[PDB]
């Protein structure tokens, strides 16, 4: 039975990289994300208004670190754009380019460990083991620009994590977020999307 | 409480359309028939459909009455490159197929899980209550593992968990020597029992 769950009792839970290019034209998404993941014992680092190069450079430098004592890795991306799902301040960012830094062979320190990419975008996925993507294309129903504007996906994701991190498995949490966001948009009448290549269960306790 | 898992106690489990396009795929097909039949699905079997015929099939099915059915399953077995769904004469786009089963277009399947098992031997429609189990490659690893996992764990494990073990099993066989891709817009837990 222990074989079916990811080992999450390493000395550290892992890093949580939050990138906020939403404001680039205190943030309610970034603040809620930080507090949520800090309560999960993640080392949270916040970034703001990064160019495409700066993001790639950041993700590379992160992959060169020693995650030997870390349980997992989390990256949260907030940005706007037209083509693709992640964006720098200049333009679109190749997701294949980023995830390659963390492939099982490229980053031995994260091999067999879950790599979580949370993505909020506003107006090609890499299939590698132990990777998970939870992305949204619609942040809210009206405006998502300044630091006071909230992303429905992100805010509900934090809420579900606050309530169910010590009970539900991660996919079940994401499913409840799917339902939460779907119900929110339905009240005013675009659902999030879970892309999972995980090989085990993810429990945060 | 029960409101967080899909209602699966309708008179019928639902349709399970198995599409076999172009030996190893024959074993997979027979395996899928037995597996879904034991889960009390109504299994319909197609062979060597053109891309036009696949679209027509999904259109006809989406125009049926699914009021008494809990879910919908479609398994596609085909080969080729530059696509994930192949007719015997070209690639098919999911956007065409899945949009017949949109929650606002197929009202008898609204809020009910719509599963697509795609096996492609060698463009994501984001809609609520859809799930895509996608793989690229007797019988094949992905289908053999999927069926064996369903047979063993349908009474206990929820679909995502079952699929997760399939990923592990397939990835391990690669190690001993690519991994399936799960795309979920499900809003509830899927248990094949009730």
With CA atoms as reference, report the closest residue to A73 among A8, A149, A160, A153: A8
With CA atoms as reference, report the closest residue to A136 among A127, A147, A123: A123
Q: Do A197 and B185 touch (CB under 8 A)?
A: no
Q: Do B181 and A197 touch (CB under 8 A)?
A: yes
- Which letter does DSSP use for residue A151 in this model? P
| Chain B residue set in contact with A, beta carbons under 8 Å | 4, 124, 126-128, 158, 160-161, 163-165, 167-168, 171, 178-189
Q: How many CB atoms lie within 10 A of CB A69?
A: 10
In three state form, how does the secondary structure of A87-144 look? ECCCCECCHHHHHHHHCCCCCHHHCCCCEEEEEEEECCCCCCCCEEEEEECCCCCCCC
Q: How far is CA A108 from the centre of its chain?
A: 21
B119 contacts B77 by C-beta, under 8 angstroms: yes
Burial of A97-106, coded b for 16+ CB within 10 Å and e otherwise, reads ebbbbbbbee
A58 contacts A17 by C-beta, under 8 angstroms: yes
Among chain B residues, CA nearest to A4: B165
Q: Which site among B6, B120, B133, B161 would you substitute to test the A interface, given the most A Cβ atoms closer than 10 Å to its Cβ? A: B161
Q: Which site among A192, A198, A203 would you substitute to test the B interface, given the most B Cβ atoms closer than 10 Å to its Cβ? A: A198
Helix (H) or strand (E) holding A194: strand A193-196
Give the torsion sign (CA, A3, A193, B120, B52): positive
Instruction: Provide the β-strand partners of residue B14.
Output: B71
Whole-number Å distance between alpha carbons of A29 and A191: 18
Both structure tokens of B67: 């009021």
A80 contacts A21 by C-beta, under 8 angstroms: yes
Rg (C-alpha) for chain A, rounded Å, is 16
Both structure tokens of A111: 């091999």
Q: Do A199 and B160 touch (CB under 8 A)?
A: no
Please count the structural domains in chain A: 1
Least CB-CB distance to A198: which of B126, B158, B167?
A: B167
Whole-number Å distance between alpha carbons of A86 and A76: 10
**Which SS3 state, helix, strand or coil, does residue A52 take?**
helix
A194 contacts A178 by C-beta, under 8 angstroms: yes
B81 burial type by CB count under 10 A (0-12 exposed, 13-18 middle, 19+ buried): exposed
A59 contacts A101 by C-beta, under 8 angstroms: yes
Both structure tokens of A126: 């890499």
Q: How far is CA A24 from the centre of its chain?
A: 19
Q: Do B4 and A182 touch (CB under 8 A)?
A: no
Contacts of B128 in chain A (CB under 8 A): 178, 182, 191
Please name the method used to determine this structure.
X-ray
Query: A183 vs chain B: nearest CA distance in angstroms?
Result: 10
Contacts of B124 in chain A (CB under 8 A): 125, 193
Q: How far is CA A61 from the centre of its chain?
A: 18
Q: Which site among A171, A182, A187 would you substitute to test the B interface, given the most B Cβ atoms closer than 10 Å to its Cβ? A: A171
- Which letter does DSSP use for residue A5 in this model? B
Chain length of chain A: 205
Phi first, then psi: give them for residue A186, nearest 5 degrees.
-65, -30
Write the DSSP assignment of chain B as a string of letters.
-GGGB----SSEEEEEEEEE---HHHHHHHHHHHHHHHTT-EEEEEES--HHHHHHHHHHHHTS--TTEEEEEEEEEEE-SS-SEE-SSSEE-HHHHHTTS-TTT-GGGTTS-EEEEEEEE------TTEEEEEEE----HHHHHHHHHHHHHTTTS-HHHHHHHHHHHHHHHHHH----EEEE--SSB--S--
With CA atoms as reference, report the closest residue to B181 among A75, A193, A120, A62: A193
The CA-based angle B46-B48-B53, given to 5 degrees, is: 75
| CATH number for the domain that contains residue A69 | 3.40.50.1460
**Which SS3 state, helix, strand or coil, does residue A11 take?**
coil
With CA atoms as reference, report the closest residue to A166 among A113, A118, A203, A115: A203
B182 contacts B190 by C-beta, under 8 angstroms: no
| Angle formed by the axes of helices B159-176 and B141-153, nearest 10° | 140
Residue A156's domain comprises 1-205
With CA atoms as reference, report the closest residue to B32 among B139, B152, B176: B139
């Amino acid at each position: 039975n222990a074989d079916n769950s990811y080992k999450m009792d390493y000395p550290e839970m892992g890093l949580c990289i939050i990138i906020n290019n939403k404001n680039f034209h205190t943030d309610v998404d970034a603040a809620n994300l930080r507090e949520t993941f800090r309560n999960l014992k993640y080392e949270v680092r916040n970034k703001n208004d990064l160019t495409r190069e700066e993001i790639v450079e950041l993700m590379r430098d992160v992959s060169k670190e020693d995650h030997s004592k870390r349980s997992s890795f989390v990256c949260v991306l907030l940005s706007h754009g037209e083509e693709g799902i992640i964006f720098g301040t200049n333009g679109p960012v190749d997701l294949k380019k980023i995830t390659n830094f963390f492939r099982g062979d490229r980053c031995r320190s994260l091999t067999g460990k879950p790599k979580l990419f949370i993505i909020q975008a506003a107006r090609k996925i890499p299939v590698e083991a132990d990777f998970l993507y939870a992305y949204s294309t619609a942040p809210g129903y009206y405006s998502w620009r300044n630091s006071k504007d909230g992303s429905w996906f992100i805010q509900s994701l934090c809420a579900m994590l606050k309530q169910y991190a010590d009970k539900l498995e991660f996919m079940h949490i994401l499913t409840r977020v799917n339902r939460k966001v779907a119900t929110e948009f339905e009240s005013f009448s675009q659902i999030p999307c879970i892309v999972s290549m995980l090989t085990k269960e993810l429990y945060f306790y």
